[PDB]
Amino acid sequence: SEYQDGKEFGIGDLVWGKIKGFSWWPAMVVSWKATSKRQAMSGMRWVQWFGDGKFSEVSADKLVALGLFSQHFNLATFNKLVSYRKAMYHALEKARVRAGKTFPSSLEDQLKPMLEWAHGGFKPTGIEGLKPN
Ligand SMILES: C[C@H](O)CN(C[C@H](C)O)C[C@H](C)O
């Protein structure tokens, strides 16, 4: 059906997506029917960006699994842009729920254990616990 071109990533997958002149940003792969636009060209994936809920058509080669977290987390962007910090909250919150993970109980101070768990490699489940369903 949709996204049957050999290439990686399917609907529901949490991803890092790279847009021109922007840091890697966290996203979720969605089906084209959620975007009110059009089917993705073969080799592309529709994604919805965490933090602003906007849709983009991105090459499957400009996406990586959000579980590869420390490799694409941009510490400088996290320090400069409040939107990037917001996007990290919603993205990692979704990772938490899927993982079966919970954290003891502000924004910075809520991010802290989420960031550490993500940077540390999503323990104990590892990246397998970020899958959809
Ligand atoms: C979170 C905000 O949408 C930031 N990016 C800039 C965009 C051009 O508005 C987009 C994408 C998430 O990389």
From Swiss-Prot:
It is found in: Nucleus. Sumoylated. Citrullinated by PADI4. Residues 11-69 form the PWWP domain. Coiled coil: none annotated. Ubiquitous; highly expressed in fetal liver, heart, kidney, placenta, and at lower levels in spleen, colon, brain, liver, small intestine, lung, peripheral blood mononuclear cells, and skeletal muscle. Isoform 1 is expressed in all tissues except brain, skeletal muscle and PBMC, 3 is ubiquitous, 4 is expressed in all tissues except brain, skeletal muscle, lung and prostate and 5 is detectable only in testis and at very low level in brain and prostate. Transmembrane segments: none annotated. It comes from the Eukaryota. Interacts with BAZ2A/TIP5, SUV39H1 and CBX4. Interacts with UHRF1. Interacts with DNMT1 and DNMT3A, SETDB1, UBL1, UBE2I9 and ZHX1. Interacts with the PRC2/EED-EZH2 complex. Belongs to the class I-like SAM-binding methyltransferase superfamily. C5-methyltransferase family. The PWWP domain is essential for targeting to pericentric heterochromatin. This is DNA (cytosine-5)-methyltransferase 3B.
